[model samples]
Target: GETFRLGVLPFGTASWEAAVIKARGFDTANGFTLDIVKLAGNDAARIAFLGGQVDAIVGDLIFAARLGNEGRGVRFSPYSTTEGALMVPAGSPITDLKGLAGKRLGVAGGALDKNWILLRAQARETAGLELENVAQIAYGAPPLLAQKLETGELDAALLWWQFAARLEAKGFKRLISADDVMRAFGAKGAVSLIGYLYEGHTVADRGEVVRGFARASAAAKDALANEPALWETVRPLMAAEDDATFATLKRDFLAGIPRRPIAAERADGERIYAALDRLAGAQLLGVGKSLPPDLYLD
Candidate 1:
């Protein structure tokens, strides 16, 4: 069987299926050997992929756009459709973006995070609020931001999906979700902002390996979605001690599994990129105003 080295953060939701794929031998059945390299973070996985240490890794589509612009060939496939959420304590008075003025807001994924940028763009376009300028934004890890929000140190937080889910289970209000923000950007359906990335050479030379991996991933998703017992095996990795949090995580994970055809996924991606590029510009994207056609698979 062909060997495919996949780099991923061991704790990320993306990595949960890594265990199932190996456990169920989906890769071997699909005509490839799954060799997963657990990295410290997404940044490390990206570095490994760049150095030719891995065949594929999870990456941001916007990042893929820049890589393609710089003559680095890559192909993208959506893994999950979940973006994130902006959560406020249930008792908080911040009803809308306008109410966030002079409030202490914590943001995960930093200033350059696509979800944050999308929210900022929507706030400016509809509410006439410059969120970044009005709110006192603090950037930190998702869990850290979640902590601050829970303790009343932060009036609100925009966090990664899992973190937001955790707070949602704890009685937090989802003031806005990434889905709402995407709709504001003119997306007709859910658009995955982050997904699987393959170096151009991998797609060109190891095409079958990529195909096999995709098949294996889809199988893994099915088992996890339909098989409740499979959750126990993956439960330790989820870090959810309470039943509510665990249930919420599983529900959202299943909901986020990408089922759309590549053609439609790319079309939504193009719409999202246009809005992102228009609002964020070259400073955030680090390349051309429009994404290259080659950045996606045909």
Candidate 2:
């Protein structure tokens, strides 16, 4: 109970602040210790939480909602900005969705991915094209997708914005950013619904402890937003290639720190969630009925 175990991806922009929180002793200052659990990937982190290895895990809102629907008492709260993009090699002729018609495209999650779904919607609405009918390949991870792009095996790829930024630093280009797709769906302001999801029982058992963790997380965000010097401390954690790449990662990392409170984030998230439902229907989310309710901690 003295330490709050937070499961985080081994090397990702999302886990950057967790490292900062642990390094700064913010959690201890807030009345609890921070236990940083390094996991293999997103699914590993989710499994670590459900298998009782950690108290909370950072992930996408929809995945957290699915976990809740699976009968786990999970509470998701906004943590950072949603960062992703549709990437292409520099100077590729594929300038837009229309150009992607006959191209071999790589995606991280194939059809079920949020960015892919958004791109499909954007393509159908803006370009009058069916995204799925294109030659699509699914990569197990973003690095593979980037590799394919580097090798000319893929004309374009849907990549997380941080990773895409790294690729861009190396001369790749973002054909369409996730923010563009979100805006196309009417998300007016900076979008960030991705957050930390705590098991419901953990919240009920240690409510104050959970709140303490959030307080420390908020403090970490403040440091990330205001103190440029602190970025150097976590620069090693980010998987950037060079100084320029690190700077790109830092810029997007700072951009992702959520400035809104839970209420505002919940409102914005609900609106986007509705748009997602309208995109490819609930089946795209692996849900036959309505999405899980109580998307926030409150």
Per residue, candidate 1 scores C-alpha lDDT tens digits across 253-284 of 88889888888889898877777777666345
* Model 2 spans > 4 angstroms off: 282-291
* lDDT values, one for every candidate: 0.83, 0.77
Query: Residue pairs in steric clash, candidate 1?
Result: none
TM match of model 2 to true structure? 0.93
Which runs of model 1 end up more than 4 angstroms from their true locations?
282-285
**Leading candidate by lDDT:** 1
In model 2, pairs of residues that clash are 73-200, 84-161
Worst 10 residues of 1 by lDDT: 278-287
The digit string of per-residue lDDT tens for model 2 on 41-119 reads 7667767888978888887776776676677788887776756788888888887688887778888744566677677
